[PDB]
Design a protein around this ligand. Structure first.
Ligand code: NAI
Ligand code: FMN
Ligand code: SF4
Ligand code: SF4
Ligand code: SF4
Ligand code: FES
Ligand code: FES
Ligand code: MG
Lengths: 230, 217, 43, 433
């Protein structure tokens, strides 16, 4: 066949060429940590949480954007990968606001869960944190941009999935802000989905605000009836 | 310190979509020549020059200018906003007639750049991010400008003034506000990147054409 | 043959449009550009 | 006698850039009088394989700072056509603090650059050359445009370039003040009308480059030395410097030296000989020397005890744990606050970070704050090891090498001047109770 042989933790996997390290690892039930990679969005490669060690390679690679080579052995749980994850989460939490009690993403935060599973347990950051002014993009999506981790998921969704190019980044460096740069409503028939793709509470639902916590809710799987798409 | 400026636009009587901006016909010819430089199907590659052209016609970049560039090149206005806010040579706020940038990076800092900066400050009576009440001078600090060998130095509207002492920069300022234009280059009788005195290399006349060509060619 | 004179004195008389004027002048010398097949990626 | 052991004294006849100081006519007629555009048609008719081999045997390495072997990098683009045009992009961003060589090359010897663009494009099969010049170099850009105009009128570039039947265009593109746009993928993105944010690799520009077409990004000096290597032989180029450190190099000596200057010298010249002979020596004498950054701000610094016998090539400076970089030598004597200088460099890197990836965007600003506190001594000795670990977390985990270049000076300062940091810490401690 065209399939090539790779190794995840010494286990042999046969993958189609072009498959990335993340997909090769997930073929054996291992989920590489991520913040900016979405499988229905274009690859970004900027969050750097997916950094993993390839055996006999001095450098860690971004698993979300690196195609697997023939004969590669991926060490998803070696000391290098763990240290890379801890450093990345340290940098992610250096400027994050202490907002978890008031954040609506409280029990549903990928930042929280991946900090508990892959990061350290304390902080050695002894400076002041950054604060970003909030943007208004309509009555559906509530914006609190101090929680933004700059994964640019919303920008990619709007540009590709929604076909609206209103969202972007202004500035550069630490003072790089996601927004519209002008007072503009992000109107789209699919505009609420940016609430879901946002890993953090930077984008939340305004009608849903403060009403419940995820552990309280009971989930019923059903069908939408507002149109014929079902 | 910090950036100081803001990367969000708030509407204002002097800066709004209805603010009048348009390109002159000669500037439209220049835009046409600029766009011709890039392959067909890739016209966004012209946002960098054209936007700069607007800032050359107007002196700064109002939101209407960004919208005009976006309309001309048929790109979403947010992409033009991103380019305008990312690059530091784009003035999203009006500046003085003479925009003075003083390098304060380590190679320039070693050659007493603070003396030049404070000399400018005491000559003009303004701070590091202000404009004179006559709107003739805007002073700011910038990173390395690529003239480290000729440090300390300043840039004034696409001109380099190198090997400066407080007297030299004061003379440049007081001659500039008299209506003239000082000649660029070092102010130390060096007029190049050569060693300060002696010209230790390249003393012999350069060799003629085909001097060291290998055989067979 | 001399070395006491600086020969890069032309840039003392450059205006704000010299670069773009030179680009306009050079426009007539360039080969036709290749085409991607579309007017824009959004087409 | 073969196998020289000493380097650092080459005569003017072997200097590639013969008008570095702008004492001659930079226009076409002067360049032709100095040997430029000589037998270019024959060189083009030799073939891309011949040019690639001539670059290979010269042992030339990338003069942008990374020191990659130029022959292999330019041969990466020797693939057959697949329907996409091929381009050559010349990097003239020149953003490293301390570097001033490419500026002089462009403003004084632009015809060398144009001829090198033609030759390299023929070697790579490039249809055209895009020259991305720094936005602040307006006079240099207009000089380059004048040179390109003269080359077009003389028939040296354009349709039927030099009469070889090869069509080649040279465009000049100006950036707008972004040091990150010196990164090759960031530069490519800036050409395409986007933000100067680097791309990830793979793909490499030889596969997907500018406009999604095969591309090669090269430095100004690397491209400019190409015609001279082709003409004078290439094997002549390898005779200079040590093995794998061949050729001549342009050095920018700045800081605390009597006469800061840009010079050309044999590659493996000792650093002390370079400073004494051309720069006029350290201010206050060689005994007054404290520290030297040998290759621009991105390289770790070295003290006086290492500068005594160190050679100025890639491998020797790697052995000294600093690297050669762009060969911009910043000299600091014993009268400067070295912590403040390194903090100013860290502030530069903080202001120049593009902000795309987490490690750079957060950690460089964190390091800036920590070094700002270190300058005043407002910290504790455990924070030195904390800062070391932070820098190690930044290094090797970023998309581009701006994170590495922000971590390295901090590591050098910690490695060689920890007692100064601790002394400032204790002075601030007892001064403020
Ligand atoms: N001239 C200046 O103003 C500045 C220079 N620098 C220097 O830039 C250097 C770092 O730049 P990088 O591009 O990240 O170095 P790099 O080692 O990653 O590669 C440099 C060149 O080698 C090519 N290359 C490397 N590996 C390749 C591969 N496996 N396949 C194909 N091509 C490959 C790349 O295409 C690139 O063009 C530093 O050493 C720094 O000193 C840094 C800042 C400013
Ligand atoms: C942050 C950063 C900034 C850079 N700036 C420049 C620059 O200004 N000029 C340059 O020639 N190379 C710069 N480089 C290195 C480029 O990658 C290099 O020029 C390019 O790879 C050409 O390599 P070559 O000299 O081997 O041909 C920079 C690299 C980084 C990481
Ligand atoms: S986004 Fe997540 S980590 Fe941040 S405050 Fe909200 S719940 Fe806490
Ligand atoms: S707002 Fe949310 S989805 Fe958008 S870039 Fe920030 S963290 Fe990512
Ligand atoms: S290391 Fe810094 S400059 Fe380079 S891509 Fe990451 S954030 Fe941008
Ligand atoms: S998930 Fe791979 S870099 Fe973000
Ligand atoms: S440090 Fe001032 S020009 Fe580079
Ligand atoms: Mg959310």
């Amino acid at each position: 066949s065209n399939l090539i042989e790779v190794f995840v933790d010494g286990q042999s996997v046969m993958v189609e060429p072009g498959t990335t390290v993340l997909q090769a690892c997930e073929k054996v039930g291992m989920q590489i940590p991520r913040f900016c990679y979405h499988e229905r969005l274009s690859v970004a490669g900027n969050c750097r949480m997916c950094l993993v060690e390839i055996e006999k390679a001095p450098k860690v690679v971004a698993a979300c954007a690196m195609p697997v080579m023939k004969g590669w052995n991926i060490l998803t749980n070696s000391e290098k990968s763990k240290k890379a994850r801890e450093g990345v989460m340290e940098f992610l939490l250096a400027n994050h606001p202490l907002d978890c009690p008031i954040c609506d993403q409280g029990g549903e935060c990928d930042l929280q869960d991946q900090s508990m599973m892959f990061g350290s347990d304390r902080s050695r950051f002894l400076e002041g944190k950054r604060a970003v002014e909030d943007k208004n993009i309509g009555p559906l999506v509530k914006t609190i941009m101090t929680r933004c981790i700059q994964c640019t998921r919303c920008i990619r969704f709007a540009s590709e999935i929604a076909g609206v190019d209103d969202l972007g980044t202004t500035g550069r460096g630490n003072d790089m802000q996601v927004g519209t740069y002008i007072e503009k409503m992000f109107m789209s028939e699919l505009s609420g989905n940016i609430i879901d793709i946002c890993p953090v509470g930077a984008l939340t639902s305004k009608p849903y605000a403060f009403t419940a916590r995820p552990w309280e809710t009971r989930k019923t799987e059903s069908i939408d009836v507002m149109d014929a798409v079902g | 310190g910090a950036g100081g400026a803001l990367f969000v636009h708030r509407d204002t009587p002097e800066n709004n979509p209805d603010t009048p901006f348009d390109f002159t016909p000669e500037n439209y010819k220049r835009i046409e020549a600029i766009v011709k430089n890039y392959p067909e199907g890739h016209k966004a590659a012209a946002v960098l020059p054209v936007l700069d052209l607007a800032q050359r016609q107007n002196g700064w970049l109002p939101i209407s200018a960004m919208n005009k560039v976006a309309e001309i090149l048929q790109v979403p206005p947010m992409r033009v906003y991103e380019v305008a806010t990312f690059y530091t040579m784009y003035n999203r706020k009006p500046v003085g007639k003479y925009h003075i940038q003083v390098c304060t990076t380590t190679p320039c800092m070693l050659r007493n750049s603070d003396s030049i900066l404070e000399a400018i400050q005491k000559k003009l009576g303004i701070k590091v991010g202000e404009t004179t009440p006559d709107k003739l001078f805007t002073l700011i600090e910038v990173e390395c400008l690529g003239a480290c060998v000729n440090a300390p130095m300043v840039q004034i509207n696409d001109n380099y003034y190198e090997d400066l002492t407080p007297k030299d920069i004061e003379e440049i300022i007081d001659e500039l506000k008299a209506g003239k234009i000082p000649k660029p280059g070092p102010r130390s009788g060096r007029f190049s990147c050569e060693p300060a005195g002696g010209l230790t290399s390249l003393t012999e006349p350069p060799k003629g054409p085909g001097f060291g060509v290998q055989a067979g060619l | 043959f001399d070395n006491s004179t600086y020969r890069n004195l032309q840039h003392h008389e450059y205006s704000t449009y010299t670069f773009l004027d030179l680009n306009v002048e050079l426009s007539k010398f360039r080969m036709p550009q290749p085409s991607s097949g579309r007017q824009s990626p959004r087409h | 006698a073969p196998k020289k052991t000493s380097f650092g004294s080459l005569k003017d006849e072997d200097r590639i850039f013969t008008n570095l100081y702008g004492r001659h006519d930079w226009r076409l007629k002067g360049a032709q009088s100095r040997g430029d555009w000589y037998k270019t048609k024959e060189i083009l008719l030799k073939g891309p394989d011949w040019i690639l081999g001539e670059v290979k045997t010269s042992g030339l390495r990338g003069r942008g700072g990374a020191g990659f072997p130029t022959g292999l990098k330019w041969s990466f683009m020797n693939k057959p056509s697949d329907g996409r045009p091929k381009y050559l992009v010349v990097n003239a961003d020149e953003g490293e603090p301390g570097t001033c060589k490419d500026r002089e090359i462009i403003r004084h010897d632009p015809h060398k650059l144009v001829e090198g663009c033609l030759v390299g494009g023929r070697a790579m099969g490039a249809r055209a050359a895009y020259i991305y010049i720094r936005g602040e170099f307006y006079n240099e850009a207009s000089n380059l445009q004048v040179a390109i105009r003269e080359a077009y009128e003389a028939g040296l570039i354009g349709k039927n370039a030099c009469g070889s039947g090869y069509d080649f265009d040279v465009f000049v593109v100006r950036g707008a003040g972004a040091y990150i746009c010196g990164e090759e993928t960031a530069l490519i993105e800036s050409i395409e009308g986007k933000q100067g944010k680097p791309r990830l690799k793979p793909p490499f520009p030889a596969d997907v480059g500018v406009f999604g077409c095969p591309t090669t990004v090269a430095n100004v000096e690397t491209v400019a030395v190409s015609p001279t290597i082709c003409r004078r032989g290439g094997a002549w180029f390898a005779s200079f410097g040590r093995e794998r450190n061949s050729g001549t190099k342009l050095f920018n000596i700045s800081g605390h030296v009597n006469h800061p200057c840009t010079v050309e010298e044999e590659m493996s010249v000792p650093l002390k000989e370079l400073i004494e002979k051309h720069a006029g020596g350290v201010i206050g004498g060689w005994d007054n020397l404290l520290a030297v950054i040998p290759g621009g701000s991105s390289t770790p610094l070295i003290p006086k005890s290492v500068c005594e016998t160190v050679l100025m090539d890639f491998d020797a400076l790697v052995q000294a744990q600093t690297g050669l970089g762009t060969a911009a030598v910043i000299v600091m004597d014993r009268s400067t606050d070295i912590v403040k200088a390194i903090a100013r460099l860290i502030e530069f890197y903080k202001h120049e970070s593009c902000g795309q990836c987490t490690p750079c965007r957060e950690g460089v600003d964190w390091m800036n704050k920590v070094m700002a506190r270190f300058v005043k001594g407002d910290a504790r000795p455990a924070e030195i090891d904390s800062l070391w670990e932070i820098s190690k977390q930044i290094e090797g985990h970023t998309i581009c090498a701006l994170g590495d270049g922000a971590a390295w000076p901090v590591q050098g300062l910690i490695r060689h001047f920890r007692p100064e940091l601790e002394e400032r810490m204790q002075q601030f401690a007892l001064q403020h109770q």
